[PDB]
Design a protein around this ligand. Structure first.
Ligand SMILES: *[C@@H]1O[C@H](CO)[C@@H](O[C@@H]2O[C@H](CO)[C@@H](O[C@@H]3O[C@H](CO[C@H]4O[C@H](CO[C@H]5O[C@H](CO)[C@@H](O)[C@H](O)[C@@H]5O[C@H]5O[C@H](CO)[C@@H](O)[C@H](O)[C@@H]5O)[C@@H](O)[C@H](O[C@H]5O[C@H](CO)[C@@H](O)[C@H](O)[C@@H]5O)[C@@H]4O)[C@@H](O)[C@H](O[C@H]4O[C@H](CO)[C@@H](O)[C@H](O)[C@@H]4O[C@H]4O[C@H](CO)[C@@H](O)[C@H](O)[C@@H]4O[C@H]4O[C@H](CO)[C@@H](O)[C@H](O)[C@@H]4O)[C@@H]3O)[C@H](O)[C@H]2NC(C)=O)[C@H](O)[C@H]1NC(C)=O
Ligand SMILES: *[C@@H]1O[C@H](CO)[C@@H](O[C@@H]2O[C@H](CO)[C@@H](O[C@@H]3O[C@H](CO[C@H]4O[C@H](CO[C@H]5O[C@H](CO)[C@@H](O)[C@H](O)[C@@H]5O[C@H]5O[C@H](CO)[C@@H](O)[C@H](O)[C@@H]5O)[C@@H](O)[C@H](O[C@H]5O[C@H](CO)[C@@H](O)[C@H](O)[C@@H]5O)[C@@H]4O)[C@@H](O)[C@H](O[C@H]4O[C@H](CO)[C@@H](O)[C@H](O)[C@@H]4O[C@H]4O[C@H](CO)[C@@H](O)[C@H](O)[C@@H]4O[C@H]4O[C@H](CO)[C@@H](O)[C@H](O)[C@@H]4O)[C@@H]3O)[C@H](O)[C@H]2NC(C)=O)[C@H](O)[C@H]1NC(C)=O
Ligand SMILES: *[C@@H]1O[C@H](CO)[C@@H](O[C@@H]2O[C@H](CO)[C@@H](O[C@@H]3O[C@H](CO[C@H]4O[C@H](CO)[C@@H](O)[C@H](O[C@H]5O[C@H](CO)[C@@H](O)[C@H](O)[C@@H]5O)[C@@H]4O)[C@@H](O)[C@H](O[C@H]4O[C@H](CO)[C@@H](O)[C@H](O)[C@@H]4O)[C@@H]3O)[C@H](O)[C@H]2NC(C)=O)[C@H](O)[C@H]1NC(C)=O
Ligand SMILES: *[C@@H]1O[C@H](CO)[C@@H](O[C@@H]2O[C@H](CO)[C@@H](O[C@@H]3O[C@H](CO[C@H]4O[C@H](CO)[C@@H](O)[C@H](O[C@H]5O[C@H](CO)[C@@H](O)[C@H](O)[C@@H]5O)[C@@H]4O)[C@@H](O)[C@H](O[C@H]4O[C@H](CO)[C@@H](O)[C@H](O)[C@@H]4O)[C@@H]3O)[C@H](O)[C@H]2NC(C)=O)[C@H](O)[C@H]1NC(C)=O
Ligand SMILES: *[C@@H]1O[C@H](CO)[C@@H](O[C@@H]2O[C@H](CO)[C@@H](O)[C@H](O)[C@H]2NC(C)=O)[C@H](O)[C@H]1NC(C)=O
Ligand SMILES: *[C@@H]1O[C@H](CO)[C@@H](O)[C@H](O)[C@H]1NC(C)=O
Ligand SMILES: *[C@@H]1O[C@H](CO)[C@@H](O)[C@H](O)[C@H]1NC(C)=O
Ligand SMILES: *[C@@H]1O[C@H](CO)[C@@H](O)[C@H](O)[C@H]1NC(C)=O
Ligand SMILES: *[C@@H]1O[C@H](CO)[C@@H](O)[C@H](O)[C@H]1NC(C)=O
Ligand SMILES: *[C@@H]1O[C@H](CO)[C@@H](O)[C@H](O)[C@H]1NC(C)=O
Ligand SMILES: *[C@@H]1O[C@H](CO)[C@@H](O)[C@H](O)[C@H]1NC(C)=O
Ligand SMILES: *[C@@H]1O[C@H](CO)[C@@H](O)[C@H](O)[C@H]1NC(C)=O
Ligand SMILES: *[C@@H]1O[C@H](CO)[C@@H](O)[C@H](O)[C@H]1NC(C)=O
Ligand SMILES: *[C@@H]1O[C@H](CO)[C@@H](O)[C@H](O)[C@H]1NC(C)=O
Ligand SMILES: *[C@@H]1O[C@H](CO)[C@@H](O)[C@H](O)[C@H]1NC(C)=O
Ligand SMILES: *[C@@H]1O[C@H](CO)[C@@H](O)[C@H](O)[C@H]1NC(C)=O
Ligand SMILES: *[C@@H]1O[C@H](CO)[C@@H](O)[C@H](O)[C@H]1NC(C)=O
Ligand SMILES: *[C@@H]1O[C@H](CO)[C@@H](O)[C@H](O)[C@H]1NC(C)=O
Ligand SMILES: *[C@@H]1O[C@H](CO)[C@@H](O)[C@H](O)[C@H]1NC(C)=O
Ligand SMILES: *[C@@H]1O[C@H](CO)[C@@H](O)[C@H](O)[C@H]1NC(C)=O
Ligand SMILES: *[C@@H]1O[C@H](CO)[C@@H](O)[C@H](O)[C@H]1NC(C)=O
Lengths: 624, 624
């Protein structure tokens, strides 16, 4: 095993555990100190205004198992500090018959048991567990724990009748899943149900969804309401909030609803951010976010989706959320988006970016797996004065249209996503910033044009505004992590409406994924404009490539070039001519970003362990 | 619900939880503070000379579940003090994937991990568990924990490869069970195996047996040897130590070997007590003690047995313990005898006395279930100058015979059992002692003759020597817990060799067991004697009746009379005449005994709890 990054990679499978720890590792984002991580969990803003972020964690392993809450905190979403207690950076772990198989995702009741922040989480026990398996009642239940020290530790309620677990009965028969409780307050839902509280006796100020589905009959999001305010044991099942069909698809802009929901959340937004009105705000929209499984051929069978919904009240005192339009929250290798309220009327969302090593070829050599996305402000994106001649505009697939009185212009409404401003400000201010001259891409444009200033390592951000003719067939974008032999190409093709990430040349190491990523992007044409504009922002962070387009479209992926000098970046151009020109402006490189974990040394590996022969005997965890 | 013990019992099922806590409760013996208990476990003499006694425990329930080690200590086997830590009187509890289903029986390595006392115990996980079920490998494994504070707490080794559990592979296929590790040192076994250590590489100074059997093919005791001295992870399977047939019986004096072993131990004894020689002591005998299951129609299908064994060395460097003769360690409602070494060359044995409420009718009203037997010194009982005309003497069923040179007398050898002298001394010295005049039982004897001094409560001991003619057909014994309407009759019938406990009148409460207990007792006739003598000792302790005959035969049972005055005792006589006389001498009543738990209030109930609906979902524990 050689770690010489000036020559071709050898057989890296011969390398020891965590010998590749720093090689591809993100530095500017949320990531576990070591080992396996997946979904964000237990997210809340603490009383001092700082952010608590939990995550599904399995230390000293590179596959999922014994799933626990790892935790850290931040004053700015950007610079983080690990908790350090008796179990290192873990704060909740399997410990009881009801959760011994794993402490799955959970969410926060800010004012819970005895006034303390309280997590409602999926407590798992023995038995077949999975959407394609024959799961039985009891395998997934929902349990409570509370913290008296701001997330340094959690105290679970006792096991038993009238205690943990608090939700255990399946609300419907033959579930494909029953997990990831999402607890939230909703003046909107309270207002809607106020006339029906006699039917159910449920009058609490907290609601909770549980994600699942029904065998052979599609996914379900189940709605519960806290039964009495200030009391946290009794949760009353109202009915299914979201019901979708078996592998139903809303279309090309909306992924696939699969067979089972995971990690669903419920929010209400307006153009500024989070909306806390009862329905009185006409600019506010109700949204559901949700992961779906087994409706995708690749991306570990997984779609992170969202839908705008209109609530109807059922005669039995429950809520049907009718999908008005439906989109995708990230088009790439990410999943399990959790969102949470933040001061100043904000709703902040964050997900999990998995690796692209599905055959587990270099995982042990990494000594870790997984990172978070960036933290994203959610809001209602409103585009005014849209041209009715925008191709496919009235399909209204993952947006809504409203005509002007005279029918000459359109207002477009959709879900907006933007990186939290604290992260952008910190990234910019800590970077070497190069403001680049505008570039016209025409007949003289090479396929690849390096920027006049170049990155110095694998930690940078790029931004650009790409102006296209209304009938263009040209393609343009960004090449990143680039040397002569290795590079990752981010293309936009307005004629097809396709944003692609081409990874055939991303790395000389052949075991990593190399399939092309794809997002759909609608360029809403503005009345009187003779062009259409794509605003592209790209974050490069070790192996993470995280792409944002127009405060709307997100695509997270991975590239693992071996060569030390595969760090370059520049402009891509295809089919640009004297007549078909792409104007590129607002160009900027941020080199360096932020060291997100200042207290951590470069190598935080603690080695890897094997569970031994009993792992296969129990059959619950891979064991490594 | 009335608790008036001067009138007939009402419907006691209407009584609240633990309302009958003190009514039938033993006061003079080892018992949990409340709730469910079974097997003794983790027994050892600590460095300060005091005794550590653990027990299978389920607080706040009256059925088995979440099985844990409860613990206490004593300087004299007699007066006890509970440990009190973070988990009350528990010191080990289910906490890990490998033992979450129950912390089953374990035994002590006195000088273990880092020199600390160390428990090897059965760690149980999910799956069918039982001799009549289809158990799989991994459901029962063996794990280590050590104590740095003399049993106040235990630290388990980590889960994983080269750590817990330390024994997990089944040594043979299709086991009926794989539990209750018994760790011991044996100069005898070391001497026997010293020539074969090249075959196995196992050279440690500790051995361990694990109890089980093979489906359809009888019980097995499996022998392991510590692989290297001073190292506790690696235990090498040698071979089956004891192999018996499917429901094989050695005869009327030996119970039944059933289908599966539980709680087996290995010891070596001489006439004085424990023997620690390599084989050089000609007066020493090797013994195995073991519980067997599913070979009895009643007594929860359970026999607590013992056998004298002769070891043979196999060619593969293992030991076959060949049964020389085989007996019963207690004939009544007791099981799971554990034995342990004690200073001054002693081997002390103690078991579990279950209740006689198998339909669980008044268990909740009790608020507890179970107690220990008394602690018993084990030794080789030797009877000299035995008459060759003793009926059935040369059957040698649960004893050995050796002829004198001239063939005119016999030496009988058997397993001896006697209550530890510390308990007898403390009991006697704290009691009101009445030494009673000898009584001849003849033609003038009533069926029942009360003693001239009477007990004052349900806590007393009786002793007597019953002298019978060699061809008697008379019966004599003791009546205890007696008023006019309720009483328990302990009879010996030399003609049949049967010691019975007749319980048809034990209680007015009909839900308690009332079947007749039976022990076999061999009266070894002495050369030149014109009579044969039974020495009977009876302990009455709340509901426990514990009977000892001749420092050999033990029978533990239960009686639950309702009436406050059902406390009387006296002599029983049947078919005594002018010609067939029973001489009773050495008669003594000890009224009061010892308060075994001086720090405990009379009512140590903490209420009872229900596990809720998930108990039936998990299917592991009754839930109450
Ligand atoms: C199988 O057996 C298992 C083992 O028994 C069993 O698990 C155990 O279950 C029990 C029962 O549910 C649990 O007991 C609860 O514990 C809660 C606290 O838990 C935390 O703290 C304990 C103890 O902490 C001490 O010890 C540890 C270990 O040494 C130290 O690390 C600590 O620093 C601390 O040490 C100090 O104290 C010691 C003495 O205790 C001293 O020795 C020492 O010097 C120190 O000073 C920890 O062990 C726990 O850790 C475990 O669990 C966490 C998850 O929670 C894991 O992460 C971890 O790995 C461990 O596994 C944990 O940190 C108690 O709060 C709780 O008591 C409340 O509930 C019960 C009812 O259920 C009530 O009777 C009781 O009165 C309490 O309720 C009151 O208080 C709360 C909060 O204040 C209120 O919300 C409530 O309304 C109520 O209020 C009342 O009083 C008010 C105030 O006066 C009044 O105003 C009100 O009006 C009202 O009346 C309970 O005791 C136990 O933790 C489990 N243990 C383990 C190891 O798992 C398992 O379930 C069994 N399984 C089955 C299937 O049966
Ligand atoms: C799923 O996830 C689970 C959660 O992570 C996981 O369970 C955990 O597994 C890990 C890994 O096995 C366990 O970690 C071990 O812990 C042992 C000690 O365990 C006891 O103590 C801890 C911590 O105690 C503190 O905290 C509690 C809680 O607050 C307090 O109550 C205590 O009072 C104490 O508090 C003080 O310290 C705190 C900081 O830690 C302070 O905050 C505080 O202020 C106090 O001052 C307890 O939590 C444990 O309780 C749990 O377990 C018991 C049963 O054991 C239960 O009854 C209970 O309910 C709880 O569940 C427990 O009491 C460590 O000894 C051990 O470390 C050794 O082993 C590892 C290798 O495995 C080595 O890396 C390490 O170096 C240590 O080895 C050395 O030391 C030993 C002994 O000294 C030697 O024998 C050994 O040879 C070696 O010697 C070396 O050093 C020598 C000396 O210098 C040298 O001479 C030698 O040459 C040599 O180099 C390890 O850390 C952890 O306990 C589990 N936790 C729980 C909650 O279960 C689970 O397995 C996962 N499941 C799966 C399937 O994956
Ligand atoms: C005395 O000690 C007991 C512990 O043994 C304490 O708890 C009670 O235990 C018994 C079992 O011993 C439980 O009985 C079972 O009850 C269920 C149905 O329960 C439902 O209805 C009850 C009656 O109104 C109600 O109290 C229950 O409420 C509790 O539980 C729910 C969760 O379900 C929880 O949300 C609440 O907060 C309460 O904690 C509950 O709604 C019944 O199905 C069982 O039947 C089975 O058992 C028998 C034998 O097999 C059989 O007849 C059936 O066929 C079936 O198989 C069983 O009867 C009882 O519910 C527990 N009560 C509780 C927890 O309050 C008890 O509290 C102690 N008393 C005192 C005064 O402290
Ligand atoms: C690096 O990180 C790993 C953790 O990932 C550390 O531990 C090793 O993990 C791997 C899995 O990643 C284990 O490999 C498995 O090994 C078994 C056979 O193991 C036996 O033989 C080994 C080789 O000599 C030996 O080291 C083992 O000894 C350990 O375990 C025993 C208990 O069995 C214990 O008593 C010892 O004390 C040791 O702890 C053991 O005797 C093999 O069956 C597995 O094969 C499966 O996996 C693959 C993929 O499915 C497949 O090819 C097979 O078909 C099969 O399904 C698997 O290969 C390895 O045993 C672990 N080694 C240990 C614990 O020492 C590793 O130590 C870290 N290195 C460093 C330097 O820290
Ligand atoms: C019954 O108990 C008596 C009293 O202990 C036993 O008689 C004693 O036997 C020993 C010999 O082992 C003598 O040292 C004593 O002098 C005897 N005491 C007497 C006669 O009072 C007797 O052996 C016991 N019988 C049985 C069958 O066990
Ligand atoms: C790389 O090494 C592995 C062992 O980790 C081996 O199985 C594989 O064949 C090697 N690849 C080569 C020689 O191309
Ligand atoms: C990182 O640390 C681990 C654990 O000490 C070690 O095994 C590994 O070799 C280290 N890797 C690098 C690249 O330093
Ligand atoms: C309420 O009605 C809906 C739609 O018919 C149904 O799916 C749900 O189960 C009902 N809720 C109940 C019975 O609590
Ligand atoms: C650099 O990053 C830190 C951590 O996020 C931030 O607080 C600080 O303001 C940044 N410095 C700037 C913008 O100059
Ligand atoms: C075409 O592109 C080059 C490079 O941006 C530029 O110098 C040139 O002026 C452009 N041509 C026209 C006609 O604008
Ligand atoms: C980068 O490194 C490679 C391999 O060492 C080398 O061939 C090349 O000249 C360097 N520069 C590039 C590709 O721009
Ligand atoms: C654009 O993407 C769609 C899938 O949404 C695909 O069918 C089509 O072939 C793509 N077109 C081009 C030119 O890439
Ligand atoms: C991409 O990976 C696949 C393995 O599935 C391989 O067949 C192919 O050659 C790779 N593409 C390259 C090197 O461009
Ligand atoms: C005693 O009370 C129980 C209720 O605990 C009842 O089921 C039973 O029939 C009663 N027995 C009678 C009236 O004999
Ligand atoms: C004993 O204590 C328990 C728990 O406090 C109580 O429920 C029960 O009624 C008491 N029983 C008696 C006989 O005092
Ligand atoms: C040693 O021999 C005995 C008797 O044949 C056998 O039962 C046992 O399994 C053997 N031990 C081994 C293979 O370790
Ligand atoms: C009474 O019992 C205690 C506790 O076992 C014991 O230490 C004491 O010696 C006894 N008193 C006597 C025999 O006078
Ligand atoms: C028969 O028994 C009684 C009572 O023990 C006694 O008084 C009487 O002397 C006995 N008879 C003979 C002949 O010993
Ligand atoms: C004992 O109590 C019962 C019931 O109160 C009474 O009938 C009897 O006279 C008393 N004495 C006895 C049975 O010796
Ligand atoms: C004595 O016990 C045996 C069982 O060991 C039984 O068969 C026999 O009937 C009994 N005899 C009497 C008289 O009780
Ligand atoms: C003993 O209990 C049984 C219940 O199995 C009952 O039929 C019988 O009458 C009881 N014996 C008495 C009261 O002597």
């Amino acid at each position: 095993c050689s770690l010489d990054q000036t020559v071709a990679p050898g057989n890296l499978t011969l390398c020891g555990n965590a010998t590749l720890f720093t090689t591809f590792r993100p530095k500017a984002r949320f990531i576990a100190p070591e080992g396996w991580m997946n979904d964000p969990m237990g997210l809340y803003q603490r009383a001092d205004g700082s952010i608590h972020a939990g995550y599904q964690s399995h230390p000293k392993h590179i596959q999922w198992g014994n799933i626990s809450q790892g935790a850290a905190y931040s004053s700015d979403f950007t610079s983080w500090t690990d908790f350090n207690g008796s179990e290192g950076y873990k704060t909740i772990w399997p410990s009881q018959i009801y959760d011994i198989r794993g402490v799955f995702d959970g969410s926060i009741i800010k004012e819970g048991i005895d006034g303390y922040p309280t997590i409602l989480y999926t407590s798992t026990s023995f038995g077949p567990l999975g959407a394609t398996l024959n799961e039985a009642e009891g395998t997934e239940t929902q349990s409570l724990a509370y913290t008296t020290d701001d997330g340094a530790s959690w105290i679970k309620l006792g096991y038993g009748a009238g205690q943990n677990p608090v939700i255990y009965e399946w609300p419907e028969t033959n579930l494909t899943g029953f997990r990831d409780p999402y607890v939230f307050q909703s003046p909107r839902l309270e207002a809607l149900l106020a006339n029906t509280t006699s039917i159910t006796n449920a009058t609490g100020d907290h609601f909770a969804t549980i994600s699942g589905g029904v065998h052979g009959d599609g996914a379900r999001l189940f709605l519960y309401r806290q039964h009495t305010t200030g009391e946290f044991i009794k949760w009353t099942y109202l009915g299914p909030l979201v019901t979708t069909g078996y592998k139903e698809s809303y279309g090309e802009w909306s992924g696939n609803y699969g067979i089972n929901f995971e990690t669903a959340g419920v929010t209400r937004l307006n153009p500024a951010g989070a909306a806390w009105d009862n329905g009185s705000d006409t600019t506010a929209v109700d949204f559901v976010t949700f992961g779906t499984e087994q409706g995708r051929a690749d991306h570990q069978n997984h779609w992170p989706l969202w839908a705008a919904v209109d609530y109807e009240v059922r005669d039995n005192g429950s809520i049907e959320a009718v999908i008005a339009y439906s989109g995708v929250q990230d088009w790439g290798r990410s999943y399990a988006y959790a969102s949470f309220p933040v001061e100043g009327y904000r709703q902040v969302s964050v997900g999990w970016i998995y690796e692209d090593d599905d055959n587990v070829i270099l995982a042990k050599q990494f000594g870790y797996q997984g990172a978070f996305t960036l933290f994203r402000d959610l809001f209602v994106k409103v585009v005014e004065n849209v041209s009715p001649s925008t191709p496919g505009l009235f399909e209204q697939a993952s947006w809504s249209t409203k005509n002007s009185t005279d029918g000459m212009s359109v207002t477009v409404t959709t879900l907006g996503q933007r990186v939290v401003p604290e992260t952008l400000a910190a990234y910019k201010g800590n970077s070497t910033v190069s403001t680049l001259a505008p570039v016209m891409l025409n007949e003289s444009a090479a396929a690849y044009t390096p920027f006049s200033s170049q990155p110095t390592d694998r930690f940078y951000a790029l931004t650009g505004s790409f102006e296209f003719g209304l009938n263009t067939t040209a393609k343009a974008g960004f090449r990143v992590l680039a040397s002569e032999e290795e590079y990752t190409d981010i293309w936009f093709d307005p004629a097809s409406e396709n944003l692609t990430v081409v990874r055939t040349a991303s790395s000389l190491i052949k075991s990593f994924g190399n399939d092309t990523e794809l997002a759909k992007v609608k360029l809403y044409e503005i009345v009187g404009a003779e062009s259409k504009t794509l605003n592209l922002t790209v974050f490069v962070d070790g192996s993470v490539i995280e792409i944002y387009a127009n405060d709307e479209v997100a695509l997270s992926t991975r590239a693992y070039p071996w060569l030390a000098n595969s760090t370059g970046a520049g402009l891509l151009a295809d089919g640009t001519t004297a007549g078909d020109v792409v104007g590129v402006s607002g160009l900027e490189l941020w080199d360096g970003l932020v060291d997100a974990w200042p207290a951590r040394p470069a190598n935080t590996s603690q080695g890897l362990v094997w569970d031994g022969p009993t792992a296969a005997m129990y059959g619950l965890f891979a064991g490594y």
